[PDB]
Design an enzyme around this catalytic site. Sequence first.
Site, PDB file in Angstrom:
ATOM      1  N   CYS A 294      97.238 163.435 -30.422  1.00  0.00           N
ATOM      2  CA  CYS A 294      97.810 162.500 -29.244  1.00  0.00           C
ATOM      3  C   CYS A 294      97.070 161.245 -29.370  1.00  0.00           C
ATOM      4  O   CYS A 294      95.966 161.053 -29.226  1.00  0.00           O
ATOM      5  CB  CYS A 294      97.440 163.135 -27.977  1.00  0.00           C
ATOM      6  SG  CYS A 294      98.222 162.134 -26.451  1.00  0.00           S
TER       7      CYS A 294
ATOM      8  N   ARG B 242      95.363 159.205 -25.548  1.00  0.00           N
ATOM      9  CA  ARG B 242      94.249 160.007 -24.876  1.00  0.00           C
ATOM     10  C   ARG B 242      93.304 159.111 -23.907  1.00  0.00           C
ATOM     11  O   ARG B 242      92.589 159.841 -23.289  1.00  0.00           O
ATOM     12  CB  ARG B 242      93.393 160.860 -26.009  1.00  0.00           C
ATOM     13  CG  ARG B 242      93.964 162.158 -26.124  1.00  0.00           C
ATOM     14  CD  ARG B 242      93.208 162.828 -27.202  1.00  0.00           C
ATOM     15  NE  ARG B 242      93.400 162.276 -28.701  1.00  0.00           N
ATOM     16  CZ  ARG B 242      92.426 162.472 -29.556  1.00  0.00           C
ATOM     17  NH1 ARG B 242      91.302 162.848 -29.472  1.00  0.00           N
ATOM     18  NH2 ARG B 242      92.956 162.012 -30.753  1.00  0.00           N
TER      19      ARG B 242
ATOM     20  N   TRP C  38     104.024 159.420 -20.841  1.00  0.00           N
ATOM     21  CA  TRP C  38     105.340 158.521 -21.102  1.00  0.00           C
ATOM     22  C   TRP C  38     105.155 158.276 -22.418  1.00  0.00           C
ATOM     23  O   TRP C  38     104.408 158.383 -23.235  1.00  0.00           O
ATOM     24  CB  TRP C  38     105.145 157.200 -19.938  1.00  0.00           C
ATOM     25  CG  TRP C  38     103.776 156.363 -20.332  1.00  0.00           C
ATOM     26  CD1 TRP C  38     103.488 155.513 -21.363  1.00  0.00           C
ATOM     27  CD2 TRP C  38     102.528 156.343 -19.547  1.00  0.00           C
ATOM     28  NE1 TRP C  38     102.330 155.066 -21.297  1.00  0.00           N
ATOM     29  CE2 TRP C  38     101.657 155.508 -20.054  1.00  0.00           C
ATOM     30  CE3 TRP C  38     102.129 157.176 -18.159  1.00  0.00           C
ATOM     31  CZ2 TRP C  38     100.418 155.463 -19.792  1.00  0.00           C
ATOM     32  CZ3 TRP C  38     100.817 156.740 -17.850  1.00  0.00           C
ATOM     33  CH2 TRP C  38      99.964 156.022 -18.430  1.00  0.00           C
TER      34      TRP C  38
ATOM     35  N   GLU D  10     108.529 156.977 -30.822  1.00  0.00           N
ATOM     36  CA  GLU D  10     109.116 158.204 -30.465  1.00  0.00           C
ATOM     37  C   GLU D  10     110.431 158.579 -30.593  1.00  0.00           C
ATOM     38  O   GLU D  10     111.299 159.141 -31.235  1.00  0.00           O
ATOM     39  CB  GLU D  10     108.390 159.004 -29.415  1.00  0.00           C
ATOM     40  CG  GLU D  10     107.065 159.145 -29.770  1.00  0.00           C
ATOM     41  CD  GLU D  10     106.167 159.985 -28.626  1.00  0.00           C
ATOM     42  OE1 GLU D  10     105.609 159.599 -27.538  1.00  0.00           O
ATOM     43  OE2 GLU D  10     106.490 161.163 -28.158  1.00  0.00           O
TER      44      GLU D  10
HETATM   45  C1  HEM Z   1     100.158 158.899 -21.343  1.00  0.00           C
HETATM   46  C2  HEM Z   1     101.301 159.156 -22.410  1.00  0.00           C
HETATM   47  C3  HEM Z   1     100.979 159.643 -23.583  1.00  0.00           C
HETATM   48  C4  HEM Z   1     101.457 158.830 -24.711  1.00  0.00           C
HETATM   49  C5  HEM Z   1     101.828 157.617 -24.806  1.00  0.00           C
HETATM   50  C6  HEM Z   1     100.924 159.889 -25.775  1.00  0.00           C
HETATM   51  C7  HEM Z   1     101.517 159.571 -27.088  1.00  0.00           C
HETATM   52  C8  HEM Z   1     101.754 160.407 -28.124  1.00  0.00           C
HETATM   53  C9  HEM Z   1     102.556 160.689 -28.872  1.00  0.00           C
HETATM   54  C10 HEM Z   1     103.210 159.631 -29.555  1.00  0.00           C
HETATM   55  C11 HEM Z   1     102.788 161.937 -29.694  1.00  0.00           C
HETATM   56  C12 HEM Z   1     103.580 162.308 -30.827  1.00  0.00           C
HETATM   57  C13 HEM Z   1     104.619 163.595 -30.492  1.00  0.00           C
HETATM   58  C14 HEM Z   1     105.590 163.763 -31.638  1.00  0.00           C
HETATM   59  O1  HEM Z   1     105.424 163.141 -32.634  1.00  0.00           O
HETATM   60  O2  HEM Z   1     106.383 164.956 -31.311  1.00  0.00           O
HETATM   61  C15 HEM Z   1     101.698 162.614 -28.898  1.00  0.00           C
HETATM   62  C16 HEM Z   1     101.163 163.979 -29.303  1.00  0.00           C
HETATM   63  C17 HEM Z   1     100.557 165.051 -28.371  1.00  0.00           C
HETATM   64  N1  HEM Z   1     100.060 164.442 -27.180  1.00  0.00           N
HETATM   65 FE1  HEM Z   1     100.230 162.789 -26.134  1.00  0.00          FE
HETATM   66  N2  HEM Z   1     100.605 161.040 -25.460  1.00  0.00           N
HETATM   67  C18 HEM Z   1     100.517 160.962 -23.834  1.00  0.00           C
HETATM   68  C19 HEM Z   1     100.313 161.980 -22.788  1.00  0.00           C
HETATM   69  C20 HEM Z   1     100.057 163.371 -23.080  1.00  0.00           C
HETATM   70  C21 HEM Z   1      99.590 164.255 -22.189  1.00  0.00           C
HETATM   71  C22 HEM Z   1      99.746 164.297 -20.538  1.00  0.00           C
HETATM   72  C23 HEM Z   1      99.052 165.379 -22.752  1.00  0.00           C
HETATM   73  C24 HEM Z   1      98.456 166.476 -22.275  1.00  0.00           C
HETATM   74  C25 HEM Z   1      97.739 166.500 -20.919  1.00  0.00           C
HETATM   75  C26 HEM Z   1      99.118 165.318 -24.176  1.00  0.00           C
HETATM   76  C27 HEM Z   1      98.945 166.172 -25.391  1.00  0.00           C
HETATM   77  C28 HEM Z   1      99.489 165.683 -26.829  1.00  0.00           C
HETATM   78  C29 HEM Z   1      99.655 166.759 -27.774  1.00  0.00           C
HETATM   79  C30 HEM Z   1      98.803 168.163 -27.446  1.00  0.00           C
HETATM   80  C31 HEM Z   1     100.241 166.184 -28.644  1.00  0.00           C
HETATM   81  C32 HEM Z   1     100.732 166.899 -29.969  1.00  0.00           C
HETATM   82  C33 HEM Z   1     101.842 167.250 -30.110  1.00  0.00           C
HETATM   83  C34 HEM Z   1     102.167 168.263 -31.364  1.00  0.00           C
HETATM   84  O3  HEM Z   1     100.966 168.799 -31.887  1.00  0.00           O
HETATM   85  O4  HEM Z   1     103.263 168.642 -31.636  1.00  0.00           O
HETATM   86  N3  HEM Z   1      99.797 163.722 -24.374  1.00  0.00           N
HETATM   87  N4  HEM Z   1     101.340 162.062 -27.753  1.00  0.00           N
HETATM   88  C1  LIG Z   2     103.766 162.937 -24.437  1.00  0.00           C
HETATM   89  C2  LIG Z   2     104.394 162.392 -25.533  1.00  0.00           C
HETATM   90  N1  LIG Z   2     104.358 160.882 -25.718  1.00  0.00           N
HETATM   91  N2  LIG Z   2     104.991 162.909 -26.611  1.00  0.00           N
HETATM   92  C3  LIG Z   2     104.762 164.363 -26.788  1.00  0.00           C
HETATM   93  C4  LIG Z   2     105.992 164.874 -27.122  1.00  0.00           C
HETATM   94  C5  LIG Z   2     107.252 164.677 -26.775  1.00  0.00           C
HETATM   95  C6  LIG Z   2     108.425 165.354 -26.906  1.00  0.00           C
HETATM   96  C7  LIG Z   2     108.351 166.313 -28.046  1.00  0.00           C
HETATM   97  C8  LIG Z   2     106.949 166.547 -28.657  1.00  0.00           C
HETATM   98  C9  LIG Z   2     107.133 167.596 -29.773  1.00  0.00           C
HETATM   99  N3  LIG Z   2     105.927 167.416 -30.437  1.00  0.00           N
HETATM  100  C10 LIG Z   2     106.103 165.926 -28.188  1.00  0.00           C
END
Ligand code: HEM
Ligand SMILES: CC(=N)NCc1cccc(CN)c1
Lengths: 420, 420
Positions: free
Chosen positions: B119, B122, B291, B296
Amino acid sequence: GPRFLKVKNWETDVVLTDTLHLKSTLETGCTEHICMGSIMLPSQHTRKPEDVRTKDQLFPLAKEFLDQYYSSIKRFGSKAHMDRLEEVNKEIESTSTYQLKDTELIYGAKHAWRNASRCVGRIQWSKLQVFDARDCTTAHGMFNYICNHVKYATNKGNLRSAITIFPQRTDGKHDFRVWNSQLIRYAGYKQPDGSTLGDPANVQFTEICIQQGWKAPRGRFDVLPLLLQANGNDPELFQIPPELVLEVPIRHPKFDWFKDLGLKWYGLPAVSNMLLEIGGLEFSACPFSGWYMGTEIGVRDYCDNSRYNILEEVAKKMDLDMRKTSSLWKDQALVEINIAVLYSFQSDKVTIVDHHSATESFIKHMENEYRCRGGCPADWVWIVPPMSGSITPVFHQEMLNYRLTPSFEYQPDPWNTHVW
Amino acid sequence: GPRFLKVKNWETDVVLTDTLHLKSTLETGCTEHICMGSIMLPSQHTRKPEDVRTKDQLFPLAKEFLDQYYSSIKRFGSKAHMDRLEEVNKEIESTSTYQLKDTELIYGAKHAWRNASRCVGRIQWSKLQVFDARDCTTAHGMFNYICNHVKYATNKGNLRSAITIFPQRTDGKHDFRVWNSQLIRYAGYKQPDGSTLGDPANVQFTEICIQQGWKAPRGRFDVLPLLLQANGNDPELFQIPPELVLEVPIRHPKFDWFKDLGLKWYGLPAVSNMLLEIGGLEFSACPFSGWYMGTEIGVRDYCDNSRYNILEEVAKKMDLDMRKTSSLWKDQALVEINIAVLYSFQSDKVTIVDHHSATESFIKHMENEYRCRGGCPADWVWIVPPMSGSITPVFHQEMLNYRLTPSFEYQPDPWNTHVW
Ligand code: HEM
Ligand SMILES: CC(=N)NCc1cccc(CN)c1
Ligand code: HEM
Ligand SMILES: C[C@H](O)[C@H](O)[C@H]1CNc2nc(N)[nH]c(=O)c2N1
Ligand SMILES: C[C@H](O)[C@H](O)[C@H]1CNc2nc(N)[nH]c(=O)c2N1
Ligand SMILES: CC(=N)NCc1cccc(CN)c1
Ligand SMILES: [Zn+2]
């Protein structure tokens, strides 16, 4: 898997089983609790300045390569194989070293490239010209071999792959080092007003050539002098014959004003600061060259912050909304600049490949290597183009990285080491 | 380093020493002879369908988290700490499980996000709304908690971070699983003429909802029904109240014809198929949302080949030279599409972040984590935007990846497992 690792292409769903990694012995830098896949010089074998390998440490390594070589020609355990082994064993005992037959040197060179996990153009791996420069003894002789290489490889814009191999490292006899990062590069000057003229990444090398006598034209695209080190002797300055350095004026197929940016680049990418290892032999001077992938120049050389960094100016000229980053003006200027590069190189008929075709053939190559060599070491962090990564197939391609030998390695810049 | 690993930013030359990796215990999938940093599901802990962890395997894990928790509040080895430990030890012995205090659940949730190596957002980690749904017992009750989440998080376009936590896994009592990948997503239909209507990545889920009764509108952007699984019972269909699903019509700030492409997307990214682990406790249903980062939607959701794949049509409409790939027409259409997304979301006043600002704050965040937590696990392959990677600072940022607990993990799609 239990021992046969799998790699999947997530866009195509294709799957490839790897058995080739079991031949790896060098370390990656990663552990079971940590991954260093995004570290530049994980130093698992970033050379050392210390003494050279010894007789004991040498034969096993030499044997490994020879067992590998003869296995390649389906002659493993032959009378020939065995006698060659005793040959080298015998030769190492007396001289502490040994010299590779001419066929072994080509196999080793081709395979160092075949094993270069960071190179996306390895599909070209079997088509390589090897220039044996092992008899060289002087910087002037080094200069000469280099010139022939340049001319050969440029081939009037119809670029050809080639690598020139100087004398292997011995011990006291000494090191041959092309003190230049790449055979052809531009100088960089630290302006008194803070600013930097020309490639900033070369400001430290350019200062060496000057304190060595170079008559710096002090401009933006000043091709730097060759500074060759032979037999462990102080390096010497040499000017590549201008008529041999092919260059390309950068213009855009629609923005006539682009021309006025005065952008130019050389067409021959020749890496000359790495190290070629074969049978435990170290070739500290092994300049190699192929041809460019557009993004190398357009995205990195030009747009990198610490490099030429032409984003603003190009953007301004486009009259782009630079009020906020969400205007994706950097992304916009970046796409145009790269269209100008391909367009220019292709207009002057100089060889170049775009990221799309380049990465497409790498997948094809990976498929060949898994279907014939049981795998292919690939560094995802490097193989994925520095722009539009997701719309190029390698992004969706899982890639297993491991170190195979023979190979190309990094080595300490000699000005840090060399005395006098 | 000898034990204090270093990470360098190659554009800025900044260096950060990592001590945090020494707290890692889960495996990365990499070895000393192999790197799997570009493998999606290295399966070092991609969950298992098999029995649940046991009493013996449970206390150590529970203790680890509690020792970690009390250390966070500088109360390590307190009367409180110790009694809490006996408390949970005692509670596990009888029930084979244990329930986290409300403070522990928030710490664990916030930190699962703080430790999510993939992520890039963070820096927002400490600002998270935790909705304790542990008392839930039905799909209808699950539906209700989910609706409140949607409404809360959307916040009329002024998006807020939040995560809703359903009952932990026990053994026989059963699993709670939001059978949907993300709370809000569009359906996909396999057309008889080969073609696929709507998001292709959802064709398999959409078929479930239909064979479950869903009245599919059979269009392009059909928000799919919620299919909730409570207490290990067959899932049940639920329609998210339309008035709660905020959407944004995609238009371009210059190409009025863009509108006609009929592109729309939802503004709330809510991942709902992962697993939250705290103190050895498994929360198989923990929908979380934040958000969007523009790429994405623009790069992946829209341009990915196996997804919406709008490159040609957008390109054609631009009247772009699609004769050859060197025209960088894909790259051109790709930049415009992404300018339309940011522009649209920002026009309707819905929260969104572009890759530039997003990755800039991640560096800032990394600097905070190294300056206060001794490090930060980051997956370079995921953290680097799927477009213009090199012009965003994270590309030049070396990143150490390791697994910290508590964390978010992947888990088997339940329709493969669940009977009936
Ligand atoms: C405030 C907004 C946030 C942004 C802009 C952000 C952005 C991102 C982006 C761009 C990805 C890629 C997703 C993909 O390619 O499918 C990602 C992955 C991830 N984010 Fe964030 N994130 C945010 C909030 C969150 C929140 C609220 C959580 C958890 C409390 C979180 C947990 C994760 C996790 C676990 C992944 C890994 C997804 C995977 O392994 O398939 N994110 N995030
Ligand atoms: C929270 C955020 N920005 N994106 C996390 C996310 C959204 C939709 C699908 C997936 C599948 N990895 C991850
Ligand atoms: C035919 C043309 C070839 C193409 C298009 C190609 C393309 C690439 C590209 C784009 C890079 C990235 C360089 C950087 O980012 O600095 C690279 C790296 C590399 N290539 Fe190739 N390559 C080709 C030929 C060669 C040849 C002839 C050899 C050797 C015989 C070679 C060995 C390598 C090595 C060792 C690297 C790693 C550089 C490093 O680690 O710093 N390449 N290549
Ligand atoms: C094969 C490779 O691991 C895969 O395509 C990865 C690369 N990087 C990614 N990065 C992000 N943010 N999201 C993804 O889905 C992926 N896919
Ligand atoms: C920090 C990170 O490893 C570094 O910026 C890498 C990323 N990928 C790269 N990929 C290529 N081809 N060339 C590079 O110089 C880099 N730099
Ligand atoms: C052969 C090729 N396409 N590029 C390799 C390369 C050229 C110049 C500099 C560097 C520094 N890593 C690498
Ligand atoms: Zn690794």
